[PDB]
Amino acid sequence: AAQRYNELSYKTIVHESERLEALKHALHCTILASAGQQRSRMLATLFKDERCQQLAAYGILEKMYLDRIIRGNQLQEFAAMLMPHQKATTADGSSILDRAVIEHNLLSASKLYNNITFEELGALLEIPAAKAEKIASQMITEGRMNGFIDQIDGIVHFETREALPTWDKQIQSLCFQVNNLLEKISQTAPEWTAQAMEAQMAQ
Amino acid sequence: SIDEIYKYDKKQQQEILAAKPWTKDHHYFKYCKISALALLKMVMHARSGGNLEVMGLMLGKVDGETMIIMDSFALPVEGTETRVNAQAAAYEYMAAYIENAKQVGRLENAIGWYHSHPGYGCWLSGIDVSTQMLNQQFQEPFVAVVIDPTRTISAGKVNLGAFRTYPKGYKPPDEGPSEYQTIPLNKIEDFGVHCKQYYALEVSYFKSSLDRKLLELLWNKYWVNTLSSSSLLTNADYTTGQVFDLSEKLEQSEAQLGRGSFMLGLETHDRKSEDKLAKATRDSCKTTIEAIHGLMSQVIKDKLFNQINIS
Amino acid sequence: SSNLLEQFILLAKGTSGSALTALISQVLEAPGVYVFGELLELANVQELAEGANAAYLQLLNLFAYGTYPDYIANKESLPELSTAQQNKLKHLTIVSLASRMKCIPYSVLLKDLEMRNLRELEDLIIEAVYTDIIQGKLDQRNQLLEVDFCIGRDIRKKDINNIVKTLHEWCDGCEAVLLGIEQQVLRANQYKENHNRTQQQVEAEVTN
Amino acid sequence: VDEDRKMYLQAAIVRIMKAKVLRHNALIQEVISQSRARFNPSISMIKKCIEVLIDKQYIERSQASADEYSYVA
Amino acid sequence: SVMACGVTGSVSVALHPLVILNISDHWIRMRSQEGRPVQVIGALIGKQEGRNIEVMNSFELLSHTVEEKIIIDKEYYYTKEEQFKQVFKELEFLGWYTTGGPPDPSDIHVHKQVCEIIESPLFLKLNPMTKHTDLPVSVFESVIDIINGEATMLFAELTYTLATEEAERIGVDHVARMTATGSGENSTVAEHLIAQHSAIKMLHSRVKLILEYVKASEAGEVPFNHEILREAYALCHCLPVLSTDKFKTDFYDQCNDVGLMAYLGTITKTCNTMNQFVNKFNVLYDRQ
Amino acid sequence: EGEFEKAHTDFFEAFKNYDESGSPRRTTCLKYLVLANMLMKSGINPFDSQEAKPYKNDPEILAMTNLVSAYQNNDITEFEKILKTNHSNIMDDPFIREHIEELLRNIRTQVLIKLIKPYTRIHIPFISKELNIDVADVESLLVQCILDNTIHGRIDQVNQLLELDHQKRGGARYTALDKWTNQLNSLNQAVVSKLA
């Protein structure tokens, strides 16, 4: 449903007002979804769409992108924007982020390192360890990831995320901060930059 | 010289093409000089394939035992490690290119082909040698070139060999060894037979003012990422594969030496399974050199960064 | 921040005294501030020192050179903080601990921050990481914080010598590493040279 | 059927030309090779189809080449 | 020249050396054959990502002179545009280059024709008559500027940068060095380690510029600052890059594997000379 | 026999002709067809192929459709609800009735293999409770499953745990070095023994 609404909002033979209601509607179907790539990835797409800033769910949107915790006042309002059939619940159904942010963060994390505990992963995605463990398992099972779990020492080992690459990538980070420092030095005072370069050519 | 090399001479090629010395000897050539252009274009095109094979063409000339590679251009053709004489599909695009090239003022004839073997080394396969052997009859002059665009980033050394192969039923000499970049488990066999059929040629260069430098300066920042190659995990699959195959060869060696080659007033002559340990020792070296090369990427980090601590 | 700093200096330079006193209380409250260099160095703030608003610079000092344990210690002499000001100092204690040890255990963090539990403590480091002023990850297995990255605020101009010493140790060993590799490459080369020599030498005599 | 053969012939030409440049004789033979199972097309028919294809701009002739066509998208 | 001489525009261009070696080579060929030096005008391709431009590659175009004006042939370009786009479609058309000394009207005439392909093309000009040691390529964009109330196409100059492509760089190393093999074949250790060597040498040079800056801000000659010192302070503190109990064993586990691997190879090598020694000995001292 | 697949195709092939003649046999044949399709494990099609389009609406055949949907999703709670609710239409026919115990085991066995994956320590009373049977039949299922290797791991019966296996690392490097290491011993013995 979310895809369909989103596509309508991108058409130019769709009336103006209705493009935005449709975007509003897309956001709401995207927020209710479960398991997989789409809920945080559509939130990011939606955030880049400048039209969401005319919406009242803009708050939830900006707060999710900037990774700011959600509170009671905002759930009450969102629940009220919902059409009656869309008040669809698991007996507590709400706005809960999770399916791209777990999945997207696991994909960003494979590019960041080697292997990790559940405690750290649960604490980082702000969910219980079991939910992470459940979605990680699903992702390994669907072959969109691979790994094995050590539940004796409470650690999942992944085809990349949090270990020997962390060491390698920290060397890269440190050396990039060195480059950054060289850029900042060139910006404030180019005089010392030229002068101190000639000091290397003397040695 | 430096400028004499840059000009092309149509007449020098006309004499050479009439004379046709290569019919006498196909091991004739010995040096290469490849343009800075030829090389950069060849690496970038190879890299655009990914880890998937691509072919391009080279324009050049020959002068004595030197081959000269003036320019190169890419082809959008698929058939490097499957289709025998993949180049044919490319012919229409080549005919266009040479015609377009002549009119701006580049008149130099096609010297040969380039392809690439990504993540398995610089060597010619069964498809490649078979396509070259037709080209040395028909296409002349025609030379094979191989480059790897992933291996190269780690080592910092350009692996580029321009080769030529010998025609069928030609006895190789004692010219064995070359650069050691590991092969996968089933590709090991294929190298083993083909290597003596060809030779690599040594390479020179020259330089001036738009492409080189964005790269040279960028390396001044960039240098950190090449030391975090960390091969041992990236191509973990290579070690297990070669070592299980090396074991099968030692079983072959135990029998070969053990029973002996059956011979009655005949003594072994050149073969790719003649003196099994002598072959085998070298296969151990291509797997060992890569492994320790992996250790050396690790050793550098450990000494340079980690020993500093906080004083 | 970025933008907000460029506004505040101009405003400080613009006014005097009674407004400057006010501005200190606002800078510390204002979000995205996890720097407190630039305003201190201006002449304008400096006048309030040695008077009845001296305590405001003395606190600003305490944030700049010091931390949460240095604060509590003279809690009486300095005027109050609000929740945003305290939470900013508490994140700013983690950067300091990170200056000494790369990995800092919970019992150290816990004492210094004077926090009620582990979960309240672990919430503060996740909030920092989203704003990206500190980068780092929690290890609940060994009970450490392992920091990826951290940034100063830390003027600390007496202690600066340490930073020069470490930069200097980083220097001297470099050359010790280069003479290093230069040696090995020549030793590889020396071996191949002799090996080529001996074989060619031996082969000739077979002919006789 | 006659009209139908033209379309199939055309489909064959585009299909073959997609799989880039071919000489006229080669193209025709392939059309026959492909179409053999269904029926043997008349040579005259093929040529007409090729021209139609060019107008449709499915395939173009090489600028300087004796009977050569390139697949143009 | 003929130039507006305005403020630097909204795009940046980055500059770097082999392609002009391609141009020079042609120029030498052409000069020898005709009997006079002949310029070439050509296209640029590269990329743009944002407002910043990386000029990655180039190719020569065909041209003719009728009057004192240059006309680039369109039919030629459109044929070469369809072949090149098949292989490189990631890259796109930036503009052109020409040859000569300071800016002149005959460049502005040709730049209007290029405006037909893309509405905003870049202009680039190389003097191979340069008496100067700095890089003698200068980059321009065209601005439409009003002078004496009449709108005139006038050029504005851009500054440059250096950028990516490690895959390409390793070839620029080989190209640059032009070194020959010694007595052997060149060693495996030698060939492997060069990047590693040069990498250390970059860190020597990186430490040096930061260090002399920090001292300068204390000493005088650079003033005191907070933004740069807080960051340098922080840069020191991160070292050493892990010390955890978790890292140590996994680091050694890989070191230990490559320690056995090496041992099993040095024995295989020794076995070979043993089989060779035993073969030659039995023939000579015994009867085998 | 065990050749569930040969049954499916013969009943499927038969149904078309049974449509032409018609009733009553179409109703009974349809039970034989659904039964057979389940046992193959799995490639289910008693309903994306062709067999009964207006007749399926009658509640008699209806049970079967629902029962098959519960088998394909492999959900225990629905299967057992149908067996109880529409008791007569499945239970009265003796052929189908015979396999039913096996079908129950089949669902529980697939459900177990899905479940197992988030853990590396899972308790036997926890899985018995989840499957809806006592500890002893689950214990007996596990033993047979490890030997068939449709569950990976071993049991700790002095603490009631499954030490599932995810204790893998590499191994592939370490075994190839062992094969390499054994040939070098035989090779040294061989070469040195050639001397005199």
mmCIF file of C-alpha atoms in Angstrom, chain F:
data_model
loop_
_atom_site.group_PDB
_atom_site.id
_atom_site.type_symbol
_atom_site.label_atom_id
_atom_site.label_comp_id
_atom_site.label_asym_id
_atom_site.label_seq_id
_atom_site.Cartn_x
_atom_site.Cartn_y
_atom_site.Cartn_z
ATOM 1 C CA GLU F 1 5.574 -47.508 -0.049
ATOM 2 C CA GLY F 2 7.150 -44.119 0.624
ATOM 3 C CA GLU F 3 6.736 -42.978 -2.998
ATOM 4 C CA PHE F 4 4.366 -40.173 -2.111
ATOM 5 C CA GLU F 5 5.251 -38.470 -5.386
ATOM 6 C CA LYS F 6 4.090 -41.279 -7.634
ATOM 7 C CA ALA F 7 0.661 -41.159 -5.751
ATOM 8 C CA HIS F 8 0.265 -37.327 -6.258
ATOM 9 C CA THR F 9 0.736 -37.392 -10.015
ATOM 10 C CA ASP F 10 -1.639 -40.567 -10.456
ATOM 11 C CA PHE F 11 -4.414 -38.887 -8.384
ATOM 12 C CA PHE F 12 -3.890 -35.532 -10.166
ATOM 13 C CA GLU F 13 -3.998 -37.216 -13.584
ATOM 14 C CA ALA F 14 -7.193 -39.113 -12.570
ATOM 15 C CA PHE F 15 -9.161 -36.125 -11.239
ATOM 16 C CA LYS F 16 -9.805 -34.642 -14.819
ATOM 17 C CA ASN F 17 -11.547 -37.776 -16.047
ATOM 18 C CA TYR F 18 -13.372 -37.890 -12.674
ATOM 19 C CA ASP F 19 -14.657 -34.360 -13.510
ATOM 20 C CA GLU F 20 -16.073 -35.609 -16.872
ATOM 21 C CA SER F 21 -17.974 -38.545 -15.469
ATOM 22 C CA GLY F 22 -18.576 -36.442 -12.215
ATOM 23 C CA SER F 23 -19.673 -37.375 -8.674
ATOM 24 C CA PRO F 24 -19.626 -39.027 -6.043
ATOM 25 C CA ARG F 25 -15.965 -40.185 -6.332
ATOM 26 C CA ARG F 26 -14.615 -36.643 -6.787
ATOM 27 C CA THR F 27 -15.209 -36.006 -3.069
ATOM 28 C CA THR F 28 -13.234 -39.136 -1.990
ATOM 29 C CA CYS F 29 -10.517 -38.777 -4.594
ATOM 30 C CA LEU F 30 -9.920 -35.234 -3.378
ATOM 31 C CA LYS F 31 -8.953 -36.529 0.194
ATOM 32 C CA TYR F 32 -6.479 -39.019 -1.452
ATOM 33 C CA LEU F 33 -4.994 -36.107 -3.502
ATOM 34 C CA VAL F 34 -4.485 -33.612 -0.490
ATOM 35 C CA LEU F 35 -3.036 -36.398 1.647
ATOM 36 C CA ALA F 36 -0.518 -37.352 -0.956
ATOM 37 C CA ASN F 37 0.620 -33.813 -1.667
ATOM 38 C CA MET F 38 1.438 -33.231 2.162
ATOM 39 C CA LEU F 39 3.700 -36.364 2.541
ATOM 40 C CA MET F 40 6.107 -35.340 -0.324
ATOM 41 C CA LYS F 41 7.556 -32.596 1.941
ATOM 42 C CA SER F 42 6.645 -30.451 0.036
ATOM 43 C CA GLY F 43 5.553 -29.027 -3.278
ATOM 44 C CA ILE F 44 1.973 -28.531 -2.419
ATOM 45 C CA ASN F 45 -0.767 -28.235 -5.068
ATOM 46 C CA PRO F 46 -4.182 -29.976 -4.177
ATOM 47 C CA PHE F 47 -5.588 -26.399 -4.792
ATOM 48 C CA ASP F 48 -2.229 -23.084 -8.016
ATOM 49 C CA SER F 49 -2.919 -26.105 -10.325
ATOM 50 C CA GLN F 50 -6.547 -27.357 -11.159
ATOM 51 C CA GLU F 51 -8.974 -29.362 -8.993
ATOM 52 C CA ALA F 52 -12.496 -28.217 -8.082
ATOM 53 C CA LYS F 53 -13.506 -24.547 -8.468
ATOM 54 C CA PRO F 54 -17.282 -24.371 -7.596
ATOM 55 C CA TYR F 55 -17.437 -27.711 -5.653
ATOM 56 C CA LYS F 56 -14.728 -26.553 -3.212
ATOM 57 C CA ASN F 57 -17.232 -24.109 -1.679
ATOM 58 C CA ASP F 58 -19.292 -26.902 -0.077
ATOM 59 C CA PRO F 59 -18.148 -27.283 3.690
ATOM 60 C CA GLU F 60 -17.335 -30.965 3.116
ATOM 61 C CA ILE F 61 -14.429 -30.332 0.786
ATOM 62 C CA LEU F 62 -13.765 -26.887 2.602
ATOM 63 C CA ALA F 63 -11.999 -28.532 5.521
ATOM 64 C CA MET F 64 -9.379 -29.935 3.323
ATOM 65 C CA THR F 65 -8.481 -26.601 1.758
ATOM 66 C CA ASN F 66 -8.056 -25.018 5.274
ATOM 67 C CA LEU F 67 -6.103 -28.118 6.502
ATOM 68 C CA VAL F 68 -3.685 -27.778 3.523
ATOM 69 C CA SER F 69 -3.261 -24.072 4.189
ATOM 70 C CA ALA F 70 -2.299 -24.860 7.797
ATOM 71 C CA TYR F 71 0.209 -27.569 6.557
ATOM 72 C CA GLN F 72 1.944 -25.186 4.046
ATOM 73 C CA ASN F 73 2.382 -22.341 6.538
ATOM 74 C CA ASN F 74 3.433 -25.113 9.119
ATOM 75 C CA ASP F 75 1.482 -23.731 12.056
ATOM 76 C CA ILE F 76 0.469 -26.305 14.731
ATOM 77 C CA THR F 77 -2.415 -24.272 16.436
ATOM 78 C CA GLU F 78 -4.559 -24.133 13.276
ATOM 79 C CA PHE F 79 -4.043 -27.746 12.281
ATOM 80 C CA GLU F 80 -5.262 -29.047 15.561
ATOM 81 C CA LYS F 81 -8.270 -26.684 15.551
ATOM 82 C CA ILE F 82 -9.534 -28.118 12.201
ATOM 83 C CA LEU F 83 -9.046 -31.713 13.368
ATOM 84 C CA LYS F 84 -11.289 -31.039 16.348
ATOM 85 C CA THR F 85 -13.918 -28.776 14.687
ATOM 86 C CA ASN F 86 -14.733 -30.664 11.445
ATOM 87 C CA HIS F 87 -13.905 -33.997 12.927
ATOM 88 C CA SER F 88 -16.119 -36.290 10.859
ATOM 89 C CA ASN F 89 -15.116 -35.196 7.336
ATOM 90 C CA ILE F 90 -11.494 -36.052 7.902
ATOM 91 C CA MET F 91 -11.678 -38.852 10.533
ATOM 92 C CA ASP F 92 -14.354 -41.221 9.140
ATOM 93 C CA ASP F 93 -12.255 -42.297 5.991
ATOM 94 C CA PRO F 94 -9.691 -44.985 7.235
ATOM 95 C CA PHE F 95 -6.944 -44.435 4.583
ATOM 96 C CA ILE F 96 -6.298 -40.747 5.284
ATOM 97 C CA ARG F 97 -6.896 -41.496 9.106
ATOM 98 C CA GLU F 98 -3.807 -43.732 9.151
ATOM 99 C CA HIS F 99 -1.207 -41.214 8.072
ATOM 100 C CA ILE F 100 -2.609 -38.422 10.361
ATOM 101 C CA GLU F 101 -0.180 -39.175 13.214
ATOM 102 C CA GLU F 102 2.688 -38.824 10.719
ATOM 103 C CA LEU F 103 1.302 -35.440 9.413
ATOM 104 C CA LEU F 104 1.243 -34.112 13.037
ATOM 105 C CA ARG F 105 4.892 -35.178 13.462
ATOM 106 C CA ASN F 106 5.680 -33.613 10.089
ATOM 107 C CA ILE F 107 4.370 -30.201 11.070
ATOM 108 C CA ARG F 108 6.055 -30.287 14.414
ATOM 109 C CA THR F 109 9.348 -31.336 12.853
ATOM 110 C CA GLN F 110 9.433 -28.362 10.319
ATOM 111 C CA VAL F 111 8.361 -25.960 13.030
ATOM 112 C CA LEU F 112 11.261 -27.172 15.162
ATOM 113 C CA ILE F 113 13.863 -26.499 12.424
ATOM 114 C CA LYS F 114 12.607 -22.862 12.027
ATOM 115 C CA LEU F 115 12.559 -22.318 15.764
ATOM 116 C CA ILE F 116 16.042 -23.659 16.490
ATOM 117 C CA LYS F 117 17.886 -20.975 14.530
ATOM 118 C CA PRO F 118 17.879 -17.878 17.048
ATOM 119 C CA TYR F 119 19.408 -20.114 19.789
ATOM 120 C CA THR F 120 22.459 -22.135 20.549
ATOM 121 C CA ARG F 121 21.117 -23.272 23.828
ATOM 122 C CA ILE F 122 17.461 -24.240 23.817
ATOM 123 C CA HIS F 123 15.689 -26.141 26.596
ATOM 124 C CA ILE F 124 13.684 -29.383 26.048
ATOM 125 C CA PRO F 125 10.670 -28.447 28.330
ATOM 126 C CA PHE F 126 10.547 -25.081 26.417
ATOM 127 C CA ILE F 127 10.230 -26.809 22.931
ATOM 128 C CA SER F 128 7.859 -29.526 24.334
ATOM 129 C CA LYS F 129 5.618 -26.747 25.694
ATOM 130 C CA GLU F 130 5.787 -24.872 22.354
ATOM 131 C CA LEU F 131 5.021 -28.023 20.298
ATOM 132 C CA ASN F 132 2.151 -29.098 22.682
ATOM 133 C CA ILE F 133 3.301 -32.562 23.737
ATOM 134 C CA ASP F 134 5.364 -34.009 26.729
ATOM 135 C CA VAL F 135 9.112 -33.889 27.110
ATOM 136 C CA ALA F 136 9.736 -37.590 26.298
ATOM 137 C CA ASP F 137 8.311 -37.644 22.682
ATOM 138 C CA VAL F 138 10.339 -34.434 21.909
ATOM 139 C CA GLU F 139 13.523 -36.099 23.344
ATOM 140 C CA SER F 140 12.919 -39.120 21.138
ATOM 141 C CA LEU F 141 12.319 -36.820 18.102
ATOM 142 C CA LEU F 142 15.549 -34.976 18.712
ATOM 143 C CA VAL F 143 17.643 -38.074 18.886
ATOM 144 C CA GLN F 144 16.303 -39.310 15.542
ATOM 145 C CA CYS F 145 16.719 -35.771 14.050
ATOM 146 C CA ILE F 146 20.435 -35.493 14.911
ATOM 147 C CA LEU F 147 21.167 -38.882 13.411
ATOM 148 C CA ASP F 148 19.123 -37.900 10.175
ATOM 149 C CA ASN F 149 20.815 -34.399 10.478
ATOM 150 C CA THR F 150 17.717 -32.129 10.127
ATOM 151 C CA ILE F 151 18.656 -30.692 13.512
ATOM 152 C CA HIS F 152 22.256 -29.684 14.197
ATOM 153 C CA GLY F 153 23.745 -30.261 17.597
ATOM 154 C CA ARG F 154 23.818 -32.538 20.559
ATOM 155 C CA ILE F 155 22.015 -32.905 23.942
ATOM 156 C CA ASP F 156 22.874 -32.260 27.435
ATOM 157 C CA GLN F 157 20.545 -34.551 29.364
ATOM 158 C CA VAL F 158 22.040 -33.681 32.853
ATOM 159 C CA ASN F 159 20.769 -30.088 32.540
ATOM 160 C CA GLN F 160 18.010 -30.560 29.761
ATOM 161 C CA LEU F 161 19.526 -28.397 27.025
ATOM 162 C CA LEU F 162 20.321 -28.620 23.374
ATOM 163 C CA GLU F 163 23.919 -27.756 22.506
ATOM 164 C CA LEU F 164 23.013 -26.873 19.065
ATOM 165 C CA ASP F 165 25.960 -26.289 16.841
ATOM 166 C CA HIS F 166 26.964 -22.985 15.745
ATOM 167 C CA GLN F 167 30.376 -23.661 17.350
ATOM 168 C CA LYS F 168 31.788 -23.549 13.712
ATOM 169 C CA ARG F 169 34.538 -21.120 12.952
ATOM 170 C CA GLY F 170 36.554 -22.062 9.763
ATOM 171 C CA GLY F 171 37.847 -25.625 9.857
ATOM 172 C CA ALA F 172 38.366 -25.739 6.136
ATOM 173 C CA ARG F 173 41.888 -24.227 6.428
ATOM 174 C CA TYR F 174 42.821 -26.510 9.369
ATOM 175 C CA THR F 175 41.816 -29.830 7.653
ATOM 176 C CA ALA F 176 43.636 -28.909 4.361
ATOM 177 C CA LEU F 177 46.758 -28.246 6.351
ATOM 178 C CA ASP F 178 46.305 -31.716 8.003
ATOM 179 C CA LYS F 179 46.046 -33.509 4.557
ATOM 180 C CA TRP F 180 49.118 -31.497 3.414
ATOM 181 C CA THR F 181 50.966 -32.355 6.710
ATOM 182 C CA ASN F 182 50.245 -36.196 6.383
ATOM 183 C CA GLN F 183 51.620 -36.301 2.662
ATOM 184 C CA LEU F 184 54.928 -34.666 3.808
ATOM 185 C CA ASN F 185 55.639 -37.427 6.267
ATOM 186 C CA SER F 186 55.104 -40.143 3.588
ATOM 187 C CA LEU F 187 57.164 -38.118 1.080
ATOM 188 C CA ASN F 188 60.110 -37.651 3.393
ATOM 189 C CA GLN F 189 60.069 -41.377 4.198
ATOM 190 C CA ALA F 190 59.889 -42.211 0.579
ATOM 191 C CA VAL F 191 62.804 -39.866 -0.598
ATOM 192 C CA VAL F 192 65.271 -40.649 2.180
ATOM 193 C CA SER F 193 64.668 -44.390 1.613
ATOM 194 C CA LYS F 194 65.875 -44.251 -2.031
ATOM 195 C CA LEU F 195 69.480 -43.713 -0.907
ATOM 196 C CA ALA F 196 71.433 -47.006 -1.326
#
